[PDB]
């Protein structure tokens, strides 16, 4: 389907906000293209529920959310009412991000999104719970591929956006389980001399059995 560094295909599809071209929609912002099996289903409701609640948190960082399903734009709007309702807001047919129409599976097939078990009422497969994170350069920066049985972690989605943006801006990398604000690791390539000069906040090396000096933390720049 898709792999790291690949450019986003500049597709055209109908969405709850009209037909559009992907790159045009994305413009000059990071983008999160995520998929969900089917409208009018429980997990997908909690997911898009959560995603709408988190939208300002994403917009503030110049990230554009856009969903996608094998349902119709009609279906989308009808379900948005259910969405706005689920999370206790006014039941319009509007959301803080478009939902993409993909009944004919053009995008599903191409992007490699198809759930192996899940099917509509005609036995035709639907998408899984996919996330693509696109940099402003239109290149894939991170992706996630979850089954329809297992809802995603949206906090984690937010976390990694934050890390992708930091590590784009600063010559560091975030360790396992990193939380926003925590220490980060100094890139293994940057020599001791340039590291002090590059991280005034402090540069702490952990001494190892191999006596190599790679294991180096520094406060979030």
Which residues are at the interface with a copy of itself (CB under 8 A)? 1, 3-5, 38, 40-43, 45-47, 49-50, 78-79, 81-82, 84-86, 91, 112, 114-117, 128, 139, 141-156, 159-160, 163-164, 167-168, 173-178, 185-186, 188, 206, 208-210, 212, 214-217
Shortest spacing between CB 54 and a copy of itself, in angstroms:
10
44, 71, 75, 102: which is the annotated catalytic residue?
44
The residue among 17 and 109 lying less far from a copy of itself, judged by its C-beta, is 109
Shortest spacing between CB 112 and a copy of itself, in angstroms:
5
The residue among 1 and 20 lying less far from a copy of itself, judged by its C-beta, is 1
Is 88 one of the annotated active-site residues of the chain?
no
CA–CA dist 125, 67 (Å, integer): 18
Helix (H/G/I), strand (E/B), else coil: 73: helix
The residue among 92 and 104 lying less far from a copy of itself, judged by its C-beta, is 92
By residue count, the chain amounts to 221
Contacts of 135 (CB under 8 A, 6+ apart): 30, 141, 164, 168
CA–CA dist 13, 101 (Å, integer): 6
Shortest spacing between CB 141 and a copy of itself, in angstroms:
6
Helix (H/G/I), strand (E/B), else coil: 39: coil
Is 137 one of the annotated active-site residues of the chain?
yes
Give how far Cα 43 sits from Cα of 83, 110, 111, 153, 180, Å: 11, 24, 22, 12, 27
The residue among 17 and 173 lying less far from a copy of itself, judged by its C-beta, is 173
| Contact of 130 with 145, CB cutoff 8 Å | yes
The residue among 40 and 104 lying less far from a copy of itself, judged by its C-beta, is 40
Helix (H/G/I), strand (E/B), else coil: 129: strand
| Contact of 193 with 86, CB cutoff 8 Å | no
**Cα angle 28-169-23, degrees, rounded to a multiple of 5:** 15
137, 155, 180, 182: which is the annotated catalytic residue?
137
Q: Token digits for 16?
A: 């709850």
Catalytic annotation, residues: 44, 137
């Amino acid at each position: 389907g898709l792999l790291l560094g690949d450019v986003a295909p500049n597709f055209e599809a109908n969405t709850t906000v009209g037909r559009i071209r992907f790159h045009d929609f994305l413009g000059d912002s990071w983008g999160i293209l995520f998929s969900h099996p089917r409208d009018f289903t429980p997990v997908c409701t909690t997911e898009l529920g959560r995603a709408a609640k988190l939208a300002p948190e994403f917009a503030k960082r110049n990230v554009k959310l856009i969903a996608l399903s094998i349902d119709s734009v009609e279906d989308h709007l009808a379900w948005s009412k259910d969405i706005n309702a689920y999370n206790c807001e006014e039941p319009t047919e509007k959301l803080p991000f478009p939902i993409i129409d993909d009944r004919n599976r053009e995008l599903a097939i191409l992007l490699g999104m198809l759930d192996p078990a899940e099917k509509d009422e005609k036995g035709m497969p639907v998408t899984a719970r996919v996330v693509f994170v696109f940099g402003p350069d239109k290149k894939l920066k991170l992706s996630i591929l979850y089954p329809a049985t297992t809802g995603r972690n949206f906090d984690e989605i937010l976390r990694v956006v934050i890390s992708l943006q930091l590590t784009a801006e600063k010559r560091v990398a975030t360790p396992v389980d990193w939380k926003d604000g925590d220490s980060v690791m100094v890139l293994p390539t940057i020599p001791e001399e340039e590291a002090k000069k590059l991280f005034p906040k402090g540069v702490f090396t952990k001494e190892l059995p191999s006596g190599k000096k790679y294991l180096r933390y520094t406060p979030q720049p």
